[PDB]
A paper describes a structure:
The TREX-2 complex (Transcription-Export complex 2) is conserved across eukaryotes and integrates mRNA export into the gene expression pathway and, in yeast, also mediates the location of actively-expressed genes such as GAL1 to the nuclear envelope. The TREX-2 complex has been implicated in a spectrum of biological roles including preventing genome instability, transcription initiation, gene-gating, and mRNA export. We circumvented these difficulties by expressing the S. cerevisiae TREX-2 complex using a single Baculovirus harboring the cDNA coding sequences of one copy of Sac3, Thp1, Sem1, Cdc31, and Sus1. Complementary structural analysis of this material has demonstrated that in contrast to the previously characterized TREX-2 complex from C. thermophilum that the CID-subcomplex is likely not to have a defined spatial arrangement with respect to the M-subcomplex and that the TPR-like repeat region of the Sac3 chain extends further towards the N-terminus than had been previously thought.
Crystals with P212121 symmetry with a = 78.2 Å, b = 84.1 Å, c = 165.5 Å that diffracted to 4.9 Å resolution using synchrotron radiation were obtained of the TREX-2 complex. However, the volume of the asymmetric unit (1,087,701 Å3) would only have accommodated the entire complex if the solvent content was of the order of 12% and so it was likely that they instead contained a proteolytic fragment of the complex. Consistent with this hypothesis, limited proteolysis experiments showed that in the TREX-2 complex Sac3 was cleaved by both trypsin and chymotrypsin to yield a stable fragment at about ∼60 kDa. The TPR-like repeat helices and the winged helix domains of both Sac3 and Thp1 were clear, although in places the density corresponding to some of the loops was less clear. Unfortunately it was not possible to identify unequivocally the residues linking these helices and so, because the density due to the side chains in these cylinders was not sufficiently clear to enable individual residues to be assigned unequivocally and so they were modeled as polyAla. No other difference density was observed that could correspond to the CID domain of the complex (containing Sac3 residues 727–805, together with two Sus1 chains and a Cdc31 chain), consistent with the crystals containing only the N-terminal half of Sac3 (up to about residue 555) together with Thp1 and Sem1. Although the material used in crystallization trials contained Sac3 residues 1–805, it was likely that, as is commonly observed, the CID-subcomplex and possibly also residues at the Sac3 N-terminus had been removed during the 2 weeks needed for the crystals to grow. Consistent with the possibility, micro-seeding attempts using these crystals in crystallization trials using freshly-prepared complex were unsuccessful.
Numbering used by the authors:
A (entry chain C): 27 to 41, 57 to 89
B (entry chain B): 1 to 455
C (entry chain A): 254 to 547
The structure:
């Protein structure tokens, strides 16, 4: 159990793009972003 | 047949087939040796080694042989503790036979030394777990092993500038092996800063012209430990290039064992938060074989909170994940360095609709204060949480100008501040990247890491 | 020649009882004698309860001395005080480790883990050490407070020979001065944090100056005094004069004239240590002996 959970590498007899190009352009409507946009609209309206 | 005389012949001619502390490989021969060596005092064993024919005229080598005879004579296979003095004594003598570069049978002794090193590390952990019952301080055995391996590491010299041969001496063949073993020991004894001497003297001692010329597995483990060290010193970019190159090199390895998958998981456990601090988010495709779906879901929740500017989200995620993040030394650095990315995305979404869509060049402090009221949520001052916490004591929506000032100083927001006007002026434009540039490029330009390929 | 533990306790009791109020005239006497108590503990290789109690209350006395010497004009330089305070915190940390390894507990450990977190407030070593301690030590309100201060004080632009800048630091000066005024802030911890007022103020004005356009008017002294919690105007005037910040109209600071990028000027000595009026006011409402006894 400790060999598999410990941060030290296990011993084994020895014998690519993985990152987002840009997550700023690929925008997805989020719940929090919806409440933030609504807050921007309400502030834009109380401050006319 | 006299088995002690036979063993002394083998050892005198560099045949170390039975020279090992592992009784699972040496049990029967060591038992016969123990029955035949019973009777003889220490001086008689020392004389057996001293007067043996063809024995190398090396005091440290003869001390090693005599120490192995004492071990074989007095070993108690039923008690690992009672035999520990013989085992560790013989191990120290064996490593002492490696300090001299021209020691007798050095090339044949090196594999023996690595084997016995793994054995004695396992036994040292085993005995350190019983430090209270053994009346020893914490990590005493393994620290002793670390001292031995440290002297061995110091004895390894850099190559002669005009060397006469391409022979890789076995002390150079195990250089990176010894570095990773020693640094792993320093991590397990919970004193990882001791790696600093080991990291500083690794490349100067190496004869290899390129770091990629070592075994790629040792390269992966070295980049893993170096990244963890850098991260212990809050150097996020330096750690990130090491975790990243480590995981790429692991992606090149053929997936022979399950332990390779778990090692990749160990790399990702640090590469995901380190990358996220630098404004980088993984594509889970190439990470499916190394991460469970629940881990991906967790880091994806944190990804959403950071991506859309939810500080309260980030602090809640760190609060729920506090215990395993502290175990991997991850909580503090994330608590400190995720907020500025989250703020960056918050004011990113604010400036997008406010400036590029609604055509307002000015950002009043009141607007950003309401936005921070939504993002931060509750603070130490607010009721319902009357005790201060790392998750409610740091961030407050009152400090609009401070957040803006740190965003501009980190190069994450290109804007001017007006404190007496209480507003923040950005450039009148429809392109949002001119106001809020890509965060990873800005961070990496302000904090240039060392060469990801070491040498 | 050496005091056993129980008379070291008797001696520190004598000090807490009879020397604390002798005030900055007895600072050298106090520091030397307390150092002698700790040295007597090291002479006997004793990390028992008496050594813990003595090092703890001695640390508290150091924290009180930090504020007392600075409130008055007596000493200015607290190098030896901070050195012996730090060494005492290291002793306490080691003893806490040995007691935890033996299965015991120390009731005041969390408080002095916080003080230890404030001894070297920019050293990541103490974050590393605090993250491997038990959850009740880590989640203690005092340790949480010290951690919050370490986060708000972190600055990616902190400049000093031998200091590697780290990414995405907060530089939350406003939050720092908000927490320094908190009535929940333990007074001795505040005294410890007063050592960084000048640095935090310098990097606050630097970071703010980088955001102002070239033709921006000087920042009024009222705004900077409420923002940085200066005790009076003479302090912000002496602060600007120290860092060569041009004072326009006698009340405003022209932040673009701040040419320094490090709080520590290369040739001159550091500006003398200062204090906060709120913490002195809190000190006058409570006794020295009360603070030292917890």
């Amino acid at each position: 159990k400790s060999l598999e959970e410990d941060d030290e590498f296990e011993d084994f007899p020895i014998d690519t793009n993985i990152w987002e190009e840009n997550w700023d352009d690929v925008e997805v409507d989020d719940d929090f972003t919806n409440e933030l946009k609504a807050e921007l609209d309400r502030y834009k309206r109380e401050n006319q | 047949m006299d088995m002690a005389n036979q063993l002394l012949d083998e050892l005198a001619h560099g045949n170390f087939s039975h020279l090992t502390l592992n009784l699972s490989q040496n049990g029967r021969e060591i038992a016969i040796l123990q029955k035949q060596l019973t009777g003889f005092d220490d001086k008689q064993l020392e004389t057996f080694v001293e007067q043996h024919p063809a024995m190398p005229n090396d005091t440290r080598f003869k001390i090693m042989c005599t120490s192995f005879l004492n071990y074989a004579r007095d070993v108690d296979p039923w008690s690992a503790w009672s035999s520990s003095d013989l085992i560790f004594e013989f191990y120290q003598c064996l490593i002492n036979c490696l300090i001299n570069d021209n020691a007798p049978h050095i090339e044949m002794l090196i594999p023996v030394a690595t084997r016995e090193t793994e054995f004695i590390i396992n036994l040292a952990g085993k005995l350190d777990s019983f430090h209270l019952q053994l009346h020893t301080r914490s990590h005493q055995f393994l620290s002793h092993i670390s001292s031995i391996l440290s002297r061995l590491f110091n004895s390894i010299k850099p190559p002669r500038g005009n060397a006469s041969s391409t022979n890789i001496p076995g002390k150079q063949r195990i250089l990176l092996y010894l570095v990773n073993k020693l640094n792993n020991i320093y991590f397990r004894i919970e004193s990882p800063q001791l790696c600093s001497n080991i990291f500083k003297n690794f490349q100067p001692k190496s004869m290899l012209a390129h770091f990629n010329e070592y075994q790629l597995d040792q390269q992966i483990e070295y980049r893993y430990l170096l990244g963890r060290y850098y991260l212990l010193n809050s150097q996020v970019h330096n750690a990130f290039v090491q975790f990243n190159e480590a995981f790429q090199s692991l992606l090149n390895l053929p997936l022979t064992n399950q332990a390779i998958t778990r090692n990749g998981t160990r790399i990702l456990n640090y590469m995901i938060p380190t990358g996220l601090i630098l404004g980088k988010m993984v594509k889970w495709g190439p990470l499916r074989p190394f991460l469970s779906q629940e881990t991906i879901d967790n880091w994806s929740v944190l990804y959403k909170h950071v991506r859309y500017g939810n500080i309260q989200g980030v602090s809640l995620w760190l609060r729920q994940n506090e215990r395993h993040l502290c175990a991997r030394q991850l909580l503090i650095v994330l608590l400190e360095k995720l907020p500025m990315v989250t703020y960056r995305n918050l004011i990113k979404t604010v400036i997008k609709s406010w400036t590029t869509e609604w055509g307002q060049n000015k950002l009043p402090y009141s607007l950003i204060e309401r936005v921070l009221q939504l993002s931060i949520g509750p603070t130490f001052e607010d009721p319902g949480a009357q005790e201060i916490t790392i998750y409610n004591g740091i961030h407050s929506p009152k400090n609009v100008e401070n957040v803006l000032v740190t965003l501009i100083n980190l190069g994450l927001l290109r804007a001017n501040c007006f404190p007496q006007l209480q507003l923040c002026v950005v450039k009148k434009t429809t392109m949002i990247q001119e106001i809020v540039p890509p965060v990873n490029e800005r961070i990496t330009k302000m904090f240039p890491a060392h060469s990801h390929v070491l040498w | 020649d050496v005091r056993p533990p129980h008379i070291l306790v008797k001696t520190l009791d004598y000090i807490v009882d009879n020397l604390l109020t002798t005030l900055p005239e007895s600072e050298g006497f106090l520091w030397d004698r307390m150092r002698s108590i700790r040295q007597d503990f090291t002479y006997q290789n004793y990390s028992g309860p008496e050594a813990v109690d003595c090092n703890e209350r001695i640390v508290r006395i150091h924290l009180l001395i930090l504020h007392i010497m600075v409130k008055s004009n007596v000493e200015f330089s607290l190098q030896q005080e901070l050195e012996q305070l730090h060494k005492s915190l290291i002793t306490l940390s080691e003893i806490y480790d040995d007691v935890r390894s033996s299965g015991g507990t120390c009731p005041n450990e969390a408080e002095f883990r916080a003080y230890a977190l404030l001894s070297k407030i920019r050293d990541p070593q103490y974050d590393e050490n605090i993250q491997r301690l038990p959850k009740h030590i880590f989640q203690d309100k005092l340790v949480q407070m010290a951690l919050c201060f370490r986060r708000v004080i972190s600055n990616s632009a902190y400049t000093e020979r031998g200091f590697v800048k780290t990414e995405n630091c907060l530089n939350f000066y406003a939050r720092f001065f908000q927490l320094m005024q908190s009535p929940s802030l333990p007074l001795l911890m505040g005294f410890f944090l007063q050592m960084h007022l000048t640095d935090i103020r310098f990097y606050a004005l630097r970071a703010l100056s980088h955001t102002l356009n070239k033709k921006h008017k000087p920042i009024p002294f009222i705004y900077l005094e409420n923002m940085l919690l200066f005790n009076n105007r003479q302090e912000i005037i002496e602060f600007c004069n120290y860092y060569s910040i041009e004072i326009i109209n006698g009340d405003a600071a022209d932040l673009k004239t701040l040419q320094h990028y490090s709080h520590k000027l290369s040739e001159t000595q550091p500006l003398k240590k200062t204090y906060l009026t709120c913490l002195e006011r809190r000190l006058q409402k409570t006794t020295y002996k009360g603070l030292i006894n917890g």
